Amino acid sequence: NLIKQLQERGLVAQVTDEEALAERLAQGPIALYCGFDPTADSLHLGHLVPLLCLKRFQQAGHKPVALVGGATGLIGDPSFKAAERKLNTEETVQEWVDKIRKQVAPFLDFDCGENSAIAANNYDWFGNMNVLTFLRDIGKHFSVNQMINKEAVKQRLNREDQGISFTEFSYNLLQGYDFACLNKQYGVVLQIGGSDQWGNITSGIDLTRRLHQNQVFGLTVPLITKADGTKFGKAVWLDPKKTSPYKFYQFWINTADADVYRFLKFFTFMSIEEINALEEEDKNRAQYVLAEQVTRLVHGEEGLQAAKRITECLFSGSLSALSEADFEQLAQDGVPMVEMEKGADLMQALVDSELQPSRGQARKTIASNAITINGEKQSDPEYFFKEEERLFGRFTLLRRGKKNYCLICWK
Amino acid sequence: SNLIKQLQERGLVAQVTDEEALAERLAQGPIALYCGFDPTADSLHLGHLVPLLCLKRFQQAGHKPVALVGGATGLIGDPSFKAAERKLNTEETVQEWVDKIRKQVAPFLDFDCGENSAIAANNYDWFGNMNVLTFLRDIGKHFSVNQMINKEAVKQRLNREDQGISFTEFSYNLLQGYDFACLNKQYGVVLQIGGSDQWGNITSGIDLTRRLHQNQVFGLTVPLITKADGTAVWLDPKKTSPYKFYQFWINTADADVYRFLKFFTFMSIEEINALEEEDKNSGKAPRAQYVLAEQVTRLVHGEEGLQAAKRITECLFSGSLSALSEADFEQLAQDGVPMVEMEKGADLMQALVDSELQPSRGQARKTIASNAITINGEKQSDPEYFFKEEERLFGRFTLLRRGKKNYCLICWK
Numbered sequence: 001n002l003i004k005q006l007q008e009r010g011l012v013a014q015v016t017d018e019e020a021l022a023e024r025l026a027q028g029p030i031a032l033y034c035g036f037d038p039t040a041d042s043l044h045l046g047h048l049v050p051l052l053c054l055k056r057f058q059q060a061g062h063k064p065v066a067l068v069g070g071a072t073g074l075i076g077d078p079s080f081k082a083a084e085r086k087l088n089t090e091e092t093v094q095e096w097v098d099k100i101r102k103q104v105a106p107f108l109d110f111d112c113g114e115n116s117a118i119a120a121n122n123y124d125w126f127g128n129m130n131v132l133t134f135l136r137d138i139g140k141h142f143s144v145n146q147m148i149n150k151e152a153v154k155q156r157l158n159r160e161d162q163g164i165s166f167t168e169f170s171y172n173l174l175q176g177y178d179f180a181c182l183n184k185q186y187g188v189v190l191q192i193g194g195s196d197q198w199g200n201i202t203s204g205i206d207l208t209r210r211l212h213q214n215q216v217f218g219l220t221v222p223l224i225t226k227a228d229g230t231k232f233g234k235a236v237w238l239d240p241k242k243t244s245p246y247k248f249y250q251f252w253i254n255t256a257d258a259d260v261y262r263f264l265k266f267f268t269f270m271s272i273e274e275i276n277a278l279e280e281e282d283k284n285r286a287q288y289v290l291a292e293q294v295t296r297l298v299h300g301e302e303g304l305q306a307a308k309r310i311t312e313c314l315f316s317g318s319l320s321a322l323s324e325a326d327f328e329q330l331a332q333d334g335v336p337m338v339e340m341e342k343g344a345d346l347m348q349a350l351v352d353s354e355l356q357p358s359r360g361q362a363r364k365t366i367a368s369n370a371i372t373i374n375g376e377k378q379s380d381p382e383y384f385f386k387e388e389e390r391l392f393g394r395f396t397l398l399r400r401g402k403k404n405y406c407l408i409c410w411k
Numbered sequence: 412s413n414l415i416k417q418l419q420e421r422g423l424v425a426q427v428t429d430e431e432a433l434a435e436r437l438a439q440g441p442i443a444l445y446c447g448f449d450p451t452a453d454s455l456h457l458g459h460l461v462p463l464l465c466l467k468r469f470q471q472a473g474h475k476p477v478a479l480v481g482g483a484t485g486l487i488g489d490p491s492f493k494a495a496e497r498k499l500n501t502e503e504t505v506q507e508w509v510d511k512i513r514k515q516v517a518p519f520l521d522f523d524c525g526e527n528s529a530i531a532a533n534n535y536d537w538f539g540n541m542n543v544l545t546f547l548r549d550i551g552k553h554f555s556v557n558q559m560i561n562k563e564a565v566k567q568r569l570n571r572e573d574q575g576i577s578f579t580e581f582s583y584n585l586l587q588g589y590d591f592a593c594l595n596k597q598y599g600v601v602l603q604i605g606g607s608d609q610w611g612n613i614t615s616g617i618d619l620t621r622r623l624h625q626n627q628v629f630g631l632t633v634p635l636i637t638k639a640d641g642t643a644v645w646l647d648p649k650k651t652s653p654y655k656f657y658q659f660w661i662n663t664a665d666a667d668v669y670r671f672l673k674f675f676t677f678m679s680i681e682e683i684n685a686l687e688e689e690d691k692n693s694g695k696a697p698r699a700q701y702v703l704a705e706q707v708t709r710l711v712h713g714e715e716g717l718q719a720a721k722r723i724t725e726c727l728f729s730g731s732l733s734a735l736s737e738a739d740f741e742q743l744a745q746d747g748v749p750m751v752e753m754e755k756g757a758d759l760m761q762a763l764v765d766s767e768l769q770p771s772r773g774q775a776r777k778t779i780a781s782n783a784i785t786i787n788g789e790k791q792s793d794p795e796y797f798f799k800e801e802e803r804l805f806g807r808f809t810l811l812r813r814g815k816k817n818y819c820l821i822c823w824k
């Protein structure tokens with residue numbers, strides 16, 4: 001039973017008419033969907049939870065529909081958002097749509113028969129829909145009394161200063177209709193999303209009954225929390241140009257012991273049995289398994305090997321295994337970096353990188369044997385870098401003591 | 412000279428935005444103004460006539476009136492001060508009503524008087540081809556839901572779910588708001604008038620004309636019809652006959668008659684004041700109701716309508732129904748007097764029971780004998796009388812009367 005299997009992973013926040021959904025799933029394959037709005041040029045870790053859930057359903061033989069909000073991205077979802085967002089341009093939203101669609105596609109199977117994935121975009125129906133048609137055909141089924149009582153907008157309906165525009169207030173109708181539209185087009189009978197999407201989902205269920213006289217279901221995943229009350233992902237992007245695979249891998253390695261088992265359940269396809277066994281076997285690790293699984297899932301085997309290779313080289317000081325592409329990950333976000341003109345001495349490089357406060361102090365620190373250049377000790381305070389120390393003619397990795405790195409990027 | 416001041420003296424100004432700046436704009440020269448009317452029926456009623464005649468009052472002062480018919484807004488429904496959600500009307504029915512209202516409105520305005528000639532407009536022209544995203548982004552971004560839910564016209568609808576408001580009717584304010592921006596761009600319309608319930612829809616239009624066209628526009632509302640005691644009359648003669656319309660004005664209370672002359676006639680304020688002064692110093696009952704009845708009936712139904720209404724009134728009081736035509740009796744059958752559909756060959760006594768002029772046959776016998784029953788103005792005291800074929804006027808109409816004022820028209824079949 002798929003619903004019970006998801007509940008055991010702690011992946012079910014809320015579910016409608018649950019007994020009936022479980023019975024529908026057990027009977028045969030269904031079509032389901034989750035939408036993702038284009039509010040940036042990439043998805044982030046938070047978005048990964050329902051995206052992996054679409055895959056969990058597909059592995060059970062169901063048909064996933066990944067909707068990208070080409071139309072909803074021009075409106076703005078206010079759900080549990082403290083402030084009104086500035087409208088984005090049509091050209092920006094279109095660019096983000098294509099990037100998000102391309103990022104989503106490798107997570108699902110588009111070539112596996114009847115249950116092959118479908119990419120959808122709500123601009124296909126809203127982009128040319130007449131205003132009177134929308135207000136009459138869709139709007140008439142929506143009670144403003146119920147809308148103002150949706151939890152997702154209550155913090156926006158107390159004062160105009162932290163208020164809500166008619167634009168963002170209409171959002172709930174667009175997501176609501178998307179569900180009716182997908183039900184009619186593909187027979188989609190389930191919509192999943194994070195717990196903040198509950199109200200947008202239930203409006204879709206009700207509208208589908210009113211428009212198409214069809215019974216559909218909703219299921220939400222909990223919004224991932226940290227035991228120490230801090231905000232999760234604080235952002236970790238899926239795009240390697242925004243968050244390098246090394247940084248991505250490191251974020252998972254540094255998961256708190258209190259979160260690692262929940263994160264294994266949420267971000268991996270590891271069985272609940274292996275995770276429970278890992279928890280018991282660790283009390284007599286999990287972070288290493290988590291980092292490995294999620295880095296491989298998002299950045300591939302090559303991304304994972306790069307992340308591990310960079311981690312080992314930094315821990316050891318032996319950099320010979322690093323490629324120029326690995327140094328590009330370090331320069332992007334892996335370690336602090338400083339741009340310097342060739343000809344700078346070791347003392348100046350220590351000052352400019354802020355590893356040392358002055359040339360006079362840097363001289364003593366160098367003399368004390370605290371400094372490595374590409375992993376090799378250098379204790380001559382009057383030292384100038386050799387050309388061979390500018391790896392690929394561009395990079396020199398400085399270290400002060402055991403762990404304070406700064407990458408020099410030669411101009 | 413000062414038009415706002417003149418309308419204020421008539422008691423025709425409920426509210427007005429920037430009374431000073433609008434008075435300045437009107438004094439600089441002619442302006443374009445508008446009022447809209449939604450197709451929610453196949454005719455306008457007396458309530459709708461007050462702003463419509465104000466469009467004429469502005470036109471007489473040299474201004475250009477635009478009469479808009481809500482081809483798009485009639486498909487949405489105005490919730491302003493309405494206790495309940497209205498059912499949606501079909502596109503076909505709204506189009507029929509749009510044509511009827513446009514045609515009924517047109518004779519009230521001059522479409523041939525130079526630069527200030529009237530314009531007939533329809534908001535379906537811009538809403539019929541507007542996409543939903545364009546509306547939500549370009550128009551909706553300027554509207555605060557916090558302000559919208561607090562507007563007097565809809566706040567009472569947000570008290571209980573079972574007596575609520577749909578998103579459709581909630582969006583109405585944005586549509587009327589955008590209409591003001593369009594007419595400002597298309598015709599240079601700087602003023603919107605309407606009844607007091609339209610204040611919120613008008614101010615949304617003023618504000619939206621600023622955000623979209625960067626122009627200063629004005630609003631002016633006329634008061635809703637209130638009676639000094641605390642208590643529909645259609646313009647279409649097939650719904651409210653010229654006779655029933657005339658009678659409604661005749662029966663206006665003394666407390667309301669002078670206000671109604673100001674609201675519903677083109678009589679100057681000096682003439683109305685002189686009439687009030689005459690009725691207060693004459694030493695008799697007022698004659699103002701007759702002046703009001705004559706003015707508004709001739710205005711809405713023409714000289715022929717007024718003359719038919721006066722003719723029907725005269726014949727009912729006198730008794731002689733000879734001057735009455737088949738068309739006149741059709742007005743009486745419609746709404747002029749209580750009416751009863753009866754099978755020919757019926758007894759007098761039995762016609763008094765069915766018409767509810769009598770409780771029973773035995774009781775009707777005593778009333779007939781007492782000489783209190785008239786058939787087409789003629790006395791009949793024979794308790795068993797049947798009815799002659801000739802007194803079925805035009806082979807179908809017989810007018811009964813018990814005493815001096817209790818009438819019932821028998822319509823034969």
Ligand SMILES: Cn1c(=O)ccn([C@@H]2O[C@H](COS(=O)(=O)NC(=O)[C@@H](N)Cc3ccc(O)cc3)[C@@H](O)[C@H]2O)c1=O
Binds near residue numbers: 048072122194200
């Ligand atoms: C666990 N978790 C997080 O920590 C953060 C987000 N999410 C879910 O990811 C999905 C995509 O997020 S979103 O903000 O882009 N989604 C929306 O704005 C939806 N209104 C997009 C949409 C959905 C359906 C539709 O027909 C049209 C547009 C969300 O499910 C979010 O909850 C997490 O799960």
Ligand SMILES: Cn1c(=O)ccn([C@@H]2O[C@H](COS(=O)(=O)NC(=O)[C@@H](N)Cc3ccc(O)cc3)[C@@H](O)[C@H]2O)c1=O
Binds near residue numbers: 635
């Ligand atoms: C004095 N009085 C009344 O007693 C009753 C009504 N009115 C005004 O008549 C005008 C027409 O009434 S309505 O119900 O057809 N009007 C509406 O529904 C507007 N929302 C139509 C409209 C207006 C502008 C626009 O851009 C689009 C549609 C109203 O002014 C009403 O207040 C009286 O004056």
Ligand SMILES: [Cl-]
Binds near residue numbers: 384
């Ligand atoms: Cl050097």
